[PDB]
Design a protein around this ligand. Structure first.
Ligand SMILES: *[C@@H]1O[C@H](CO)[C@@H](O[C@@H]2O[C@H](CO)[C@@H](O[C@@H]3O[C@H](CO)[C@@H](O)[C@H](O)[C@@H]3O)[C@H](O)[C@H]2NC(C)=O)[C@H](O)[C@H]1NC(C)=O
Ligand SMILES: *[C@@H]1O[C@H](CO)[C@@H](O)[C@H](O)[C@H]1NC(C)=O
Ligand SMILES: *[C@@H]1O[C@H](CO)[C@@H](O)[C@H](O)[C@H]1NC(C)=O
Ligand SMILES: *[C@@H]1O[C@H](CO)[C@@H](O)[C@H](O)[C@H]1NC(C)=O
Lengths: 206, 52, 51
């Protein structure tokens, strides 16, 4: 269970390297669902992300769609008043045909712009026919950034945006990592851990 | 120097530097410790040979 | 050569996707040529499709 909707994750190994040194975080709602997008619809689900037999979507992201037949411009901003680094994630949708794009966003030339104090990028959708991965011919690309304390981040779009919904305030520490293992979890206490088992010893070699 | 999206290369550079430093410190200390005993044994053997 | 001014190339696989657009400019001649050709490659896994 990774990305239920097929797509490309940018700088995935760098994100793993960053998360290897985090000991705790705080998950907070950066853009509340019920009060941030009055002009748009915020109820969009896919059959490739099904939960309990019914189609659903991610929990930290939001799928915006045009309301009343219009998709007006959106511009949102957030300032980091948390005395900590904030990890922000978003996405961009690439539909499989021009008819789907016109039905979904009511435009043919769409742009997404994400700008920070030391970060800036622009995205444009690409429409093409692709082999189906999880019964889908479209794609979604995922992006992330780290926001310093006292900084501001701005999103501008007129279509194809998968908006952030939750963010994390990171706290760092030494002596952590990510390991892959098949061993079961027990109730013991030790000073050394390996992918095969724990070690209770003071010998100089192993 | 590395930018923010180059943490793995920075970690590899640090690992290489630390490993080489550890190895050379170990080598120097072990060499000095091992030669110090042989010198004293050499002197004792010389005195014994002169007496004999 | 191609009877068009805005051309595109799209190469798509299961885990590969890219789009290319030509760039027209005047460049110093290398082997008596002022145009260029850019070369790309990919590895395709068994059972996969490329378009
Ligand atoms: C999370 O991971 C589980 C597996 O650990 C996923 O369940 C598996 O989902 C696939 C795709 O829906 C199932 O394959 C399908 O099976 C049906 C019926 O045999 C077939 O008609 C389809 O063509 C396809 O082959 C697979 O059976 C299913 N496995 C189990 C044990 O339920 C699940 O979809 C993942 N969910 C997310 C949100 O990533
Ligand atoms: C769209 O939402 C904005 C809030 O950002 C609001 O000011 C505006 O009135 C809304 N549109 C309409 C037609 O009411
Ligand atoms: C939405 O953005 C486009 C492009 O920037 C602009 O032409 C248009 O006037 C904007 N809509 C409104 C209501 O300002
Ligand atoms: C390791 O030794 C400590 C010291 O008493 C003990 O508390 C702990 O249960 C031991 N763990 C294992 C897995 O033997």
């Amino acid at each position: 269970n990774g990305t239920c909707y097929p797509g490309y994750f940018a700088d995935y190994e760098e994100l793993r390297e960053q998360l290897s040194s985090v000991s705790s975080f705080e998950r907070f709602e950066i853009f509340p669902k019920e009060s941030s997008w009055p002009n748009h619809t915020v109820t969009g689900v896919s059959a490739s992300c099904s939960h309990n037999g019914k189609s659903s979507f991610y929990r930290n992201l939001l799928w915006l769609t045009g309301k009343n037949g219009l998709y007006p411009n959106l511009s949102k901003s957030y300032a980091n008043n948390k005395e900590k680094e904030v990890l922000v994630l978003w996405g961009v949708h690439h539909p499989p045909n021009i008819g789907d794009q016109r039905a979904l966003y009511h435009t043919e030339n769409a742009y997404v712009s994400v700008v920070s104090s030391h970060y800036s990028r622009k995205f444009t959708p690409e429409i093409a026919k692709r082999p189906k991965v999880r019964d889908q011919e479209g794609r979604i690309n995922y992006y992330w950034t780290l926001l310093e304390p006292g900084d501001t981040i701005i999103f501008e779009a007129n279509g194809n945006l998968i908006a952030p919904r939750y963010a994390f305030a990171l706290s760092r520490g030494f002596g952590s990592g990510i390991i892959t293992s098949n061993a079961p979890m027990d109730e013991c206490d030790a000073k050394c851990q390996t992918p095969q088992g724990a070690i209770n010893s003071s010998l100089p070699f192993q | 120097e590395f930018n923010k999206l180059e943490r793995r290369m920075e970690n590899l550079n640090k690992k290489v530097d630390d490993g080489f430093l550890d190895i050379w410190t170990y080598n120097a200390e072990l060499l000095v410790l091992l030669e110090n005993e042989r010198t004293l044994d050499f002197h004792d053997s010389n005195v014994k040979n002169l007496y004999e």
